[PDB]
Design a protein around this ligand. Structure first.
Ligand SMILES: N[C@H](CO)Cc1c[nH]c[nH+]1
Ligand SMILES: N[C@H](CO)Cc1c[nH]c[nH+]1
Ligand SMILES: [Zn+2]
Ligand SMILES: [Zn+2]
Lengths: 431, 432
């Protein structure tokens, strides 16, 4: 059965242990791959693609324009169109109006949005089918107006990429498909090749080799940033005595099935909760799951924390900073103001995380590992730069400029002072 | 004389090489900086003290002080009035970036929203030694203050005599800084990232610094320290676009304003169109630089600076977007009309009466901005830099009945039966 803790008892040391996921080295094997793709373009990408993926491709980048539209079963198409629709609407609503701030008359300042010109989106491939991720990444890129959108998705063993991913890629305006994975794919995007466009920002979780390539390349002469660390998936469920045990169990298992390193945490808030029934439901439901071996492995390092009340339970969750938080408690919505650290939040009894994973409209590319303490999930803003713009009239300069001279003199920066002084003289000499 | 290029002459390799700043490749700096970081990680306050003694020439018993325990310095009235004006303009501009948090309900019973929450603990790097940078203290502390950050650590190396300057302290107090870390360099960054015996561990570290500070930030964002950073914000850069209507002495003063920051600064002049007297700008630069206290720094920055001729404004702004400057001053006729063409720039100053100095100090925009070409994908510090945006969703039964079937389909396609069953089990119990 799952390990149980009583929150009031926990020492500082035990709490720090609870908030730390299983630990992380990788950089040694990845750099030669990075450097090689940097030095030898596509040819090296293909060598690593034969070794690691067992696929011989002559054309590792396709213009998505040149690809035929995939053939989908109509129920599948319909569902992906609903996901697109909701994700599009949710992300499109994040556009900021851009208004002038004019505190001092003649001193006009504004913040404007510009798209990142070129972006790379990594979606695991081969046997993986992750059209959901393709949408979570490409839809905001589409909305932001990124000119080049490269999607890295390694092909199946017969040279062909997952058709559901292609469908989503075409719907969301992906320009280039990079039929490749791993660190070779990342480096290809960060550095550019003969046929791969160079990108300015790389998004999307992958394996150790992907994450490592991303982390190396962000600090490199490639001049590239990345979205976040987004490692093994996580869910923290808060449940009280009104939660249905089989539903609580099903939510825990929904993310535990992602892999044996996933982390799942149940916080029981208050009295009257049937922990035996929950445990019982977890074991039974896990036994009948196709991926029950991954889930059982993930549950082997999962845990239950008992909190005296909802306030203590949310306090624990805030310390943990879970990728996903499900709050299955009475009047869940009222607790929103107490949430501090959580990638994405699911409120009430009819909101399994599965809905956010797939089609609610929110983005499932989210910070794991504790990184929700300082990173947000992918959003429209992840694809934008905000440039500040200011303009002064003569009068504006007369009002503000003397303050600036004063401050510059204080810092010992006389040239900063004189850029103002010379202009004020010129204004006086015509006035 | 400043080196000159004509865009229409250059090959692609030549053109692309003008993107390069006068900075060391990152790996060389990581070698210099790594052992410092690990030293502070292993050995705490002792290591920081050792570095502060060696490099800042000061022996401190307390390297961290609680700001509430420090005296309120007394400032000359005019100085005080000027910083209070800057505070007020920076506050107003940043406070206006607060987002409304409207609910989206595409499908009935499917409600989603994005809400802002502050980063709990932040570290702010204010450069020092012979730099006095109270302006940067405001640029960083004011938005932290507006966001609600609970722990705010300000790091600032003690000046020649061995003291944190009083103007930095005034600004820190007015903006709610909680702790002052009286160190600088990569050892300051490490102390904040890892925490020490007396330095709070922070979640995010902000601020401009020299090549070594910047490299420390970049290294620690990949570390097990669990820390993020704002951006690579290194030595200041300005690109000025000037036409025939620009006054040459004003153009020269703008270039020099930022050249004086240090020998590793870079300044670019792009002449747009005809009629510009480049020799007058050059003479004006030379004459002005010779009268500057820091003319030495400025002359060294100018040695890797250059002038580019562009046939028109379109080509000028295209070049600027490639360079991707920290700061862009557009001193051309109808400057405001060119705003739509600007793609990569940290902060832009439009017209003839808008020297970068005003945004450096008090216009209200943020001066902590990406350098090196990082304006291609990073923004300057803003309110959002101090926030996380959490997505929140809630479905009614009706919402789940409508959306849930699509979710089951998608989860089936991906081979994720447990994701499907968290919906199916709810829908079955509804139907029972
Ligand atoms: N739970 C994952 C991280 O948000 C996303 C996902 C995709 N498919 C199923 N789940
Ligand atoms: N130009 C610097 C980087 O934006 C900011 C500054 C402070 N004091 C004078 N200038
Ligand atoms: Zn999932
Ligand atoms: Zn400056």
């Amino acid at each position: 059965p799952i390990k149980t803790y009583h929150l009031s008892n926990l020492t500082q040391t035990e709490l720090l242990s609870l908030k730390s996921r299983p630990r992380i080295s990788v950089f040694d094997i990845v750099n030669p791959i990075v450097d090689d793709v940097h030095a030898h373009g596509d040819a090296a990408v293909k060598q690593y693609t034969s070794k690691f993926d067992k696929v011989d491709l002559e054309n590792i980048v396709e213009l998505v324009s040149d690809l035929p539209d995939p053939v989908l079963d109509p129920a599948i198409k319909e569902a992906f169109d609903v996901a697109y629709s909701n994700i599009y609407a949710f992300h499109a609503a994040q556009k900021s109006p851009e208004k002038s701030v004019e505190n001092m008359k003649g001193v006009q300042c504004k913040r404007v949005a510009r798209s990142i010109n070129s972006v790379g989106l990594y979606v695991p491939g081969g046997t993986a089918v992750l059209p959901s991720t393709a949408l979570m990444l490409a839809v905001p890129a589409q909305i932001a107006g990124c000119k080049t959108i490269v999607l890295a998705n390694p092909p199946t063993r017969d040279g062909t990429t997952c058709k559901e991913v292609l469908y989503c890629a075409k719907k969301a305006g992906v320009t280039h498909l990079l039929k490749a994975g791993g660190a070779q794919a990342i480096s290809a995007m960060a550095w550019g090749t003969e046929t791969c466009p160079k990108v300015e920002k790389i998004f999307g979780p992958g394996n150790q080799y992907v994450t490592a390539a991303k982390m190396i390349l962000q600090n490199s002469e490639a001049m590239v940033s990345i979205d976040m660390p987004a490692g093994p998936s996580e869910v923290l469920v808060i449940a009280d005595k009104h939660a249905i045990p089989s539903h609580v169990a099903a939510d825990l298992l929904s993310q535990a099935e992602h892999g044996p390193d996933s982390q799942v945490v149940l916080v029981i808030a208050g009295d009257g909760v049937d922990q035996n029934a929950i445990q019982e439901e977890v074991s039974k439901q896990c036994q009948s799951l196709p991926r029950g071996e991954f889930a059982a492995k993930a549950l082997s390092h999962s845990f239950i924390v008992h909190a005296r009340d909802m306030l203590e339970a949310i306090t624990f969750s805030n310390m943990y900073a879970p990728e996903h938080l499900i709050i299955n408690v009475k009047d869940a919505e009222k607790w929103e103001s107490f949430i501090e650290n959580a990638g994405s939040v699911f409120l009430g009894s009819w909101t399994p995380e599965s809905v956010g994973d797939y089609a609610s409209g929110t983005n499932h590319v989210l910070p794991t590992y504790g990184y929700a303490r300082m990173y947000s999930g992918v959003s429209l803003d992840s694809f934008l730069k905000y440039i500040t713009v200011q303009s002064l009239t003569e009068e504006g300069l007369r009002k503000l400029g003397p303050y600036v001279e004063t401050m510059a003199e204080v810092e010992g920066l006389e040239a900063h002072k004189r850029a103002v002084t010379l202009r004020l003289q010129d204004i006086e000499a015509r006035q």
